[PDB]
């Protein structure tokens, strides 16, 4: 009976306008818009950039998310930066995995 | 007098993009007697010693091997012998190197502990350790780094990879750094990177700071606007 | 001595086998024991359509037997379960009741061997009634299989061997990947060496399924 | 055709709780007039010796006489020497075993780190770790207990200890034990016993629990509005 | 005449790392150079004794042997005899004293209480009390270090071992290390080492700080009155 209404994946959000019926008499019925966000409390500001501050504060204006300052990474998109690597003094590119569960090659 | 044969480092196939070995014999005279061709399986020998460096503080004698060959080739399984014909050695002896066979591929789960609350009590230094578990084979890479600047080899030090008692096939690694406590109380992250077969692009890096490693305060501003936002 | 997933499919309440000691015998290791119920996750979550029916039933004989064993002596070697405190947790609280009754003299699960058998965690999620003759081995029966020397050897071929038979009756090197259980029935088959004369006419004869597995793999 | 003299070191100390000394003959058959004693400088070698090992087909037998000594006289550098005469070798061979005075005494200071969120996150397995830091001899010993009962050699690896460039004059070593999530979250205390000579004690204990690591204060503030 | 026999304690043979064997005399003559000695089951020769109290004023002499041994034969339950051999002693009199043995051995327990918050807003001192129960034997020795270094044992004191009410064999002590607020409001180890036989290394121990314990202290403040309906 859930209409998920948005599944934002940065800005956590499950906004499901599920209809409920009231008791066994209709025409007051109840509905509710659960916004069930799940915050990270642990990602970093510029979530893509490990080295950049934390989070916190966290924006939920749910008129924009209806319709980015990204706060958790989506399961499936792969989020990553360019990393310096250092061997024997050749300071080589290299793409890294900051979520390495979802990233296999697929 | 002795000479080892040194399986190629992981670090030199990916970032250098290239296999090299080493076969390199020291604490001997210099009598530039050496022969070293590296042999492979087959009756070809892919390469010999090249760039000699003798040059060292101690004035003795050494020379190092050099074998090019396929990364490709590498995963085979083809093995390669170094062979030294100087006359310190009592006789010849080959040093066949080889690809381990059946070695399973397991991702190196890396973790970031940061000091104990205690150690900055201390009040004197603070070190943190980067945690390699889980991963196969055993051949692993770690490095450093604080805000993009990676640190000096010597400034972190790495342990030899052991295995891991649940898991008789994986592996663990752990690599420590130290700081002062004042450079971990400024807040600078610290970002510890492992290159290593199993991980998609081969390299993962995990990172650290005052505020995340089991931080005390969880400093929180949650605010919603607009809660019906009817659509 | 192989040890099968009994140290994942027990799943123990926390307060047994967690450090904290247990209040009274009568109500938290009642309730405790009973308390899992949790013990119902073959056919709730993973037997649920894996196998037969009959399977995750039996599954569940294994795990009783398993769990009688804690309470006195099984094989495990773990602060948890064996050399462990819980079976101490037993005997501290039976002797606080002026020794009224050793943990092997009664609740050995036989004075209460009942329990749920586990059932009620099988209706839970499964919801698929247990034949009467099923019914008799989630409880109680005389015989104890051995000192879980040779039932936990009961279920290695039970599944382990039986489903790798079939598997290479339906490449060939992973067909032959499947001789490296071969090796390790040799170590065990020392271990049961130390009535029938080895653990093959066991499979044979106590066993039901175990005859439809091959006696040897040898390649 | 030389005797390897085996000075039980620290961690052999502490496990046996006592000191078991040998001495090891290496590439050398056994021959009549074979003789064993523990000779210090006062010159008292009146030790008992017993199970004197056999001939050995590569010619390296122990012959080993052991005795019982106090841990301090032997910390004085007594320089314990078994005394062998051979046939094929008329001059008897000395091997001194002592400890050198001139290694410093740096007490450990050892650190306990509990798992890192991130395990206890996907929930598969904790990874405590022990982190022993900062002592100048090359002979710690780490035990781990839990629920005050000593755990087996094998479920902890304990790293050997190497030098830290940080502090040329300290070594540094680590001893990682790995437990079930179910078991971590259970609330047990695991004890990083670490045993090492210069400490004034010579055993230190740190507690790894559930809660060790928390956060003490948690500032949540929702604002809830109804327009932009 | 009359001897005394002192079997070493488990605080002496922790304390100095070493087994003090000391046979004192009371009621004795005082005289140059009293001669005395301890015997082993084998009777070898001690060492030298040395320290020898002087002629106190009372005009009786306490003659004190003390003898170095290793730790291996007193827990071994082989058995000392004190001799004294004197002129003015009309006789050697034999005292024989071992490791006592038959006694169960038992964990102890240390639980560290911190000091109350009452004794806190005095601002005077605080006593952070180390429990010590449940072992036995009767032979403990507590001892508190702070930042790895012992403390003086004039700031804690270590009450005797005590029969505990619940078991008989068991036993229980104390040990308080009154410290002034100021060092306890910053955060300072506190270590409270106890050694007894029965433990698996003969030690544990027990820190506490101002933060060991102080349970989450959520701050939820929420403002809900910016929705106007
Ligand atoms: C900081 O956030 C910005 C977006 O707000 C991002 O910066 C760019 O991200 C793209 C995405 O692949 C990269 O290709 C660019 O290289 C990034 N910019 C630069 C200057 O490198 C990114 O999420 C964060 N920036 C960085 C450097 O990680
Ligand atoms: C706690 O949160 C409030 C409001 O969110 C903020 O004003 C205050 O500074 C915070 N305190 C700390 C110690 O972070
Ligand atoms: C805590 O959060 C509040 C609200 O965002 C902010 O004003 C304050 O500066 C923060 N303090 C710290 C220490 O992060
Ligand atoms: C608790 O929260 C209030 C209001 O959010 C704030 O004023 C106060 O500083 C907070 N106290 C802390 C974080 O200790």
Same mark, same amino acid.
């Given at each position: ?106 | ?9 992981? #670090? ?50 050494? #020379? ?102 649940? #898991? ?59 809660? #019906?936002?009817?659509? | ?70 309470? @006195? ?37 036989? @004075? ?108």
């Amino acid at each position: 009976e859930r209409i998920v209404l948005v599944d934002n994946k940065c800005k956590c959000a499950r906004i499901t306008s599920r209809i409920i019926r009231s008791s066994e008499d209709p025409n007051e019925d109840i509905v509710e818009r659960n916004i069930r966000i799940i915050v990270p409390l642990n990602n970093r500001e510029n979530i893509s950039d490990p080295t950049s501050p934390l989070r916190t504060r966290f924006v939920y204006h749910l008129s924009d998310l209806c319709k980015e300052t990204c706060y958790t990474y989506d399961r499936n998109k792969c989020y990553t930066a360019v990393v310096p690597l250092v061997y024997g003094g050749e300071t080589k590119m290299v793409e890294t995995a900051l979520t390495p569960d979802a990233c296999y090659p697929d | 007098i002795r000479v080892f044969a040194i399986p190629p480092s992981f #670090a030199s196939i990916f970032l250098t993009k290239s296999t090299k070995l080493t076969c390199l014999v020291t604490d001997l005279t210099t009598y530039d007697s050496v022969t070293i061709s590296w042999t492979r399986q087959n009756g070809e020998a892919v390469k010999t010693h090249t760039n000699i460096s003798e040059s060292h503080p101690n004035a003795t004698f050494s #020379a190092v091997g050099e074998a090019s060959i396929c990364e490709d080739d590498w995963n085979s399984g083809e093995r390669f012998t170094c062979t030294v014909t100087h006359t310190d050695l009592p006789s010849p002896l080959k040093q066949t190197i080889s690809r381990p066979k059946g070695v399973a591929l397991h991702r190196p789960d890396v973790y970031l502990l940061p000091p104990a609350r205690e150690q900055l009590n201390l009040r004197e230094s603070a070190t943190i350790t980067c945690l390699v578990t889980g991963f196969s084979p055993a051949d692993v890479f770690v490095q450093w780094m604080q805000r993009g600047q990676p640190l000096s080899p010597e400034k972190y030090v790495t342990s030899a990879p052991m295995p891991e008692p649940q #898991a008789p096939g994986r592996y663990f690694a752990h690599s420590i750094l130290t700081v002062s406590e004042e450079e971990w109380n400024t807040g600078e992250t610290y970002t510890c990177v492992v290159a290593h077969e199993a991980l998609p692009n081969r390299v993962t890096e995990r990172t650290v700071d005052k505020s995340t490693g089991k931080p005390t305060l969880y400093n929180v501003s949650l605010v919603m606007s607009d809660t #019906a936002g009817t659509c | 001595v192989l040890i099968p997933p009994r140290r994942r499919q027990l799943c123990f309440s926390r307060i047994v086998r967690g450090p904290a000691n247990l209040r009274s015998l009568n109500e938290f290791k009642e309730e405790i024991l009973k308390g899992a119920q949790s013990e119902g996750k073959f056919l709730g979550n993973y037997y649920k359509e894996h196998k037969d029916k009959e399977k995750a039933l039996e599954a569940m004989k294994n795990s009783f037997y398993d769990y009688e064993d804690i309470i @006195k002596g099984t094989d495990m070697l773990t602060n948890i379960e064996f050399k462990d405190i819980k079976i101490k947790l037993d005997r501290l609280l039976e002797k606080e009741t002026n020794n009224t009754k050793k943990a092997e003299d009664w609740w050995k699960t036989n @004075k209460k061997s009942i329990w749920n058998a586990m059932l009620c965690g099988y209706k839970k999620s499964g919801n698929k009634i247990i034949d009467p003759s099923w019914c008799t081995i989630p409880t109680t029966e005389t015989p104890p299989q051995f000192l879980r020397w040779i039932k936990e050897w009961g279920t290695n071929v039970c599944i382990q061997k039986q489903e790798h038979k079939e598997y290479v009756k339906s490449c060939t090197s992973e067909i032959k990947k499947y001789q490296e259980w071969s090796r390790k029935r040799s170590i065990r088959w020392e271990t049961i060496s130390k009535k029938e004369p080895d653990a093959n006419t066991y499979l044979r004869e106590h066993c039901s399924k175990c005859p439809c597995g091959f006696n040897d793999m040898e390649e």
